[PDB]
Design a protein around this ligand. Sequence first.
Ligand SMILES: O=C(c1cncc2ccccc12)N1CCN(c2cccc(Cl)c2)C(=O)C1
Ligand SMILES: O=C(c1cncc2ccccc12)N1CCN(c2cccc(Cl)c2)C(=O)C1
Ligand SMILES: [Cl-]
Lengths: 301, 305
Amino acid sequence: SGFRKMAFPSGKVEGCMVQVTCGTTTLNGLWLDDVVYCPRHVICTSEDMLNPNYEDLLIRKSNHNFLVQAGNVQLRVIGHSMQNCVLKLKVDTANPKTPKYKFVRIQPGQTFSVLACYNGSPSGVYQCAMRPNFTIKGSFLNGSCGSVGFNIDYDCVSFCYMHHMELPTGVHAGTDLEGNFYGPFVDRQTAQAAGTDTTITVNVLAWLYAAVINGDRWFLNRFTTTLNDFNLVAMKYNYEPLTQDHVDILGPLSAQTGIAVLDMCASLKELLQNGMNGRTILGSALLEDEFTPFDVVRQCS
Amino acid sequence: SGFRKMAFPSGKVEGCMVQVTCGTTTLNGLWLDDVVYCPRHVICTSEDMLNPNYEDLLIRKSNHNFLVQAGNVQLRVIGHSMQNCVLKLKVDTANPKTPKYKFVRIQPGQTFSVLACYNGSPSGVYQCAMRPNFTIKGSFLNGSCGSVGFNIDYDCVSFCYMHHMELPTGVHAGTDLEGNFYGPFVDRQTAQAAGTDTTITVNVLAWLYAAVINGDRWFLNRFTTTLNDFNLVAMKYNYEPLTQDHVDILGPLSAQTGIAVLDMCASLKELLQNGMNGRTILGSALLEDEFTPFDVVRQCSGVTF
Ligand SMILES: O=C(c1cncc2ccccc12)N1CCN(c2cccc(Cl)c2)C(=O)C1
Ligand SMILES: O=C(c1cncc2ccccc12)N1CCN(c2cccc(Cl)c2)C(=O)C1
Ligand SMILES: [Cl-]
């Protein structure tokens, strides 16, 4: 029993974190096999950040311009290349702690664990979700660039995020491990803003199913709804539209609790209309949207 | 920017988790040096749990009755002894991954990371607090016993909790690593209940300081209060008393934000008497009490391990 915001154990990722320095800039790198991945902006100076020409800045660098430190050991850089917004530094030593891994690009609503790092050293682990506006509400300070997001379903680590920047509203933007940004962001100091964010509806429904599995039924009601009437109401509360894919994904939780998806949608519409009236659901006075249907099944079962 | 419920990196503890089997019961063990620690109830059958005589049940066991698996390697048990509610299995191999560690017993209000494990394999890490009623609001299923709670102070892992049971309300009970239960609980299948819980006041204040550091100021006000007046309000709302020690601990956060502790108490008093009025603090519509003053400073300063 109980339902917590739970992160994956971070050990497999901790053994991959290194410190990358290029000139005066120091950030984190991810050392897998003989390659160290880090944000390409590590090569920028203060006067380069508005409109950097990364190809031009990179061509000017040699291997010895990159200092990579793994613990108290300096790794030797023997190659460097750029893939989109990530810099890949070939090193002369394969990481003996390299776990079984893969690079996966995630979609909005997906959740992942973030291992926040400073100077190549892990400081904390927390759970995040890719917001519908492609930002993440992380907890990051100066020096956290290169910190990664991942999932570890079984013993394979799927790396899905690398931290690049903090937007003016305090939210974060980054890339997948192939260097492609999530959202309409660029690795430049130019004026950029997160679009209006919305609530991840499918995740809220998953979390209501978690509450039912854990014995909470107060918010249930005798009503159902059509998918289209649900969407017309939910969009008025800035909730993401619920698609037939989301309804299908909730099928196993629906079968387990005996509550049809459109029946739970009617509970959600009522919760949006009435609020909680002094009550809580799984220890929360707000509707939680950073648990996916997969997270609920893994944690409750 | 941002403020998350953040656990310590779990790697140092992951390298200590093993699977302990005794008969039909399988749970988790903590392997440090040449000793594997686990709940002593691993030796009980369902009948034994009703009124167990652990000394009598243990005397009947030999070393080979304990199967310890570290990854895909079976460890050889060469001794077994009991310390309070923990069983200590001496093994023939010291754990090469043993970090610098200590066993510490924590106080209510103190937070720690829990590494939830099943079959000796870590499945998740989450941050929680020792409640004032000595339970933890954990997230645990069948097979989670022996999962541990810890903090990291510098480069040393301080183990503070080992999971033993789930109470009827879904909250959890366990011991320190010396086998002493937190709370008035016993390791037996008998009627037990969590007492009425209270809110950890010093932690709520620490979290309000975190909200201010992150740019949320709506709840601030021009008022201050006395410690005696505030403690009268705290008692009325099932909040733990705030002591001068708590006020002193909040000193650095008070100096950093310019909000004196008693000034933040007046914000808290107003929140208790009026609610949030449709507003949120750090994405919450409830006052969060599972961040200590140390957690707030650590997260807002980026201390690494
Ligand atoms: O190191 C950080 C950083 C990271 N995360 C959270 C922070 C909170 C406070 C202060 C600094 C940070 N930076 C430097 C790079 N940087 C950036 C600026 C413009 C473009 C690019 Cl790709 C990157 C940042 O946004 C900020
Ligand atoms: O493995 C668990 C367990 C743990 N945590 C959360 C769970 C949620 C659902 C089902 C089982 C669990 N047990 C077995 C031992 N056990 C117990 C029973 C009586 C006394 C003692 Cl000390 C211990 C339990 O309470 C329950
Ligand atoms: Cl309140």
